[PDB]
Each structure stands twice: as structure tokens, then as C-alpha cells.
Amino acid sequence: GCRFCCNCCPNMSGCGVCCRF
């Protein structure tokens, strides 16, 4: 159960996997 996000950490100019909502 995870979702793609484009603002989790100030070290990636794109999107990553997010599991906290």
C-alpha cells in the first residue's frame, strides 16, 4: 500500500514512492 508523490524530500526533481498519508 504506497502512492507516488513529487514532494517527499528536498533531493529529487521528480516523484518518489510515498507510504505516509
From Swiss-Prot:
Compartments, as annotated in UniProt: Secreted
Family per record: Belongs to the hepcidin family.
Lineage, top ranks: Eukaryota, Metazoa, Chordata, Craniata, Vertebrata
Purpose of the protein: Seems to act as a signaling molecule involved in the maintenance of iron homeostasis. Seems to be required in conjunction with HFE to regulate both intestinal iron absorption and iron storage in macrophages.
Disulfide bonding pattern of the chain: C2-C19, C5-C8, C6-C15, C9-C18
Induction: By bacterial challenge.
Tissue note: Predominantly expressed in liver.
Name the UniProt record assigns to this protein: Hepcidin
